[PDB]
């Protein structure tokens, strides 16, 4: 599926939360400097791209 989260977009599949984050930490950039984890603009749910 394609996704657009308030600006930045992407295309892939989505997975439930597995990590803890930090309550103002919402992005999930990896060692490859690519976005792969983000939280919902409407709810506090971690999702993995």
């Amino acid at each position: 599926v394609n996704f657009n989260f308030n600006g930045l977009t992407g295309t892939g599949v989505l997975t439930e939360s597995n990590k803890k984050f930090l309550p103002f930490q919402q992005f999930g950039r990896d060692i490859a400097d690519t976005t792969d984890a983000v939280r919902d603009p409407q709810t506090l749910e971690i999702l993995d791209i």
Partner: protein, 270 residues
């Protein structure tokens, strides 16, 4: 009103590994990454002010490229902050009130006193409700207002040993005032502790202003009564606090699996 202390009359110490904050809003797990920004240089001379409290000063602290403030204080006698350049109702300036009830964030054009501080507050019933007020007393040409949670932890800590330490970082980039806070438990009672911790962004105010000088506010009862000994008891040594300046370099950092800041190395140190 305005009370100025006519009779007016800096113990350099060391900060080991303090002043490390998350440089952005991304999460990296168990990797290493380096950025170039304004941190505290490691092992620098930091100015510990007059370690008494009887004693009240009106110093001149210049602001230049971000300020790291750190002052543990029981019962939270430290309550406010001043940021500005001219302080005589010429241009805009910023004021912070951190009392127990709320937090007040002003950008105003106040007629600041040479030593802004509240004196004496008279009698209601064994309690603290303020009666006297002398910090600006005029020049109220502002229509700005801001309410949030008060950053400081609560008051009336009467333990013999030091228990809590409060550290803040104020950064002025592109008129986008960034405040980094950490309330930490320490029990060693000796200056700046030797340890490693992270700082977190919680307050971001986009305003745009020029700052060259800064101060801070206290609040107490010096006499508790107007007629007897109103204001003559104090001299220029107000309180003890740590102020550090910031320098731009590269500060390569290591993350853990939890994403918490674990270690950082300064590139141009050794």
């Amino acid at each position: 009103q305005c009370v100025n202390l006519i009779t007016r009359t800096q113990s350099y110490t060391n900060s080991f590994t303090r002043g490390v904050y998350y440089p952005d809003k991304v999460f990296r797990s168990s990797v290493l990454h380096s950025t170039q920004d304004l941190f505290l240089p490691f092992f620098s001379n930091v100015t510990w002010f007059h370690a008494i409290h009887k004693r009240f000063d009106n110093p001149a602290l210049p602001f230049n490229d971000g300020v790291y403030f750190a002052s543990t204080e029981k019962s939270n006698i430290i309550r406010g902050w001043i940021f500005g350049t001219t302080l005589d109702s010429k241009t805009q300036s910023l004021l912070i009130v951190n009392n127990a009830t709320n937090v007040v964030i002003k950008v105003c054009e106040f007629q600041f006193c040479n030593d802004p501080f509240l004196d004496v507050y008279q009698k209601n019933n064994k309690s603290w409700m303020e009666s006297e007020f002398r910090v600006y007393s005029s020049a109220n040409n502002c229509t700005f207002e801001y309410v949030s949670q008060p950053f400081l932890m609560d008051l009336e800590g009467k333990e013999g040993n030091f228990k809590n330490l409060r550290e803040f970082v104020f950064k002025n980039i592109d008129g986008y005032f960034k405040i980094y806070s950490k309330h930490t438990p320490i029990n060693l009672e000796r200056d700046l502790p030797q340890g490693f911790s992270a700082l977190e962004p919680l307050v971001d105010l986009p305003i745009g202003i020029n700052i060259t000088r800064f101060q801070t506010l206290l609040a107490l009862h010096r006499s508790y009564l107007t007629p007897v000994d109103s204001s003559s008891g104090w001299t220029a040594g107000a309180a003890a606090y740590y102020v550090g300046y910031l320098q731009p370099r590269t500060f390569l950092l290591k993350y853990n699996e939890n994403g918490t800041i674990t270690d950082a190395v300064d590139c141009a140190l050794d």
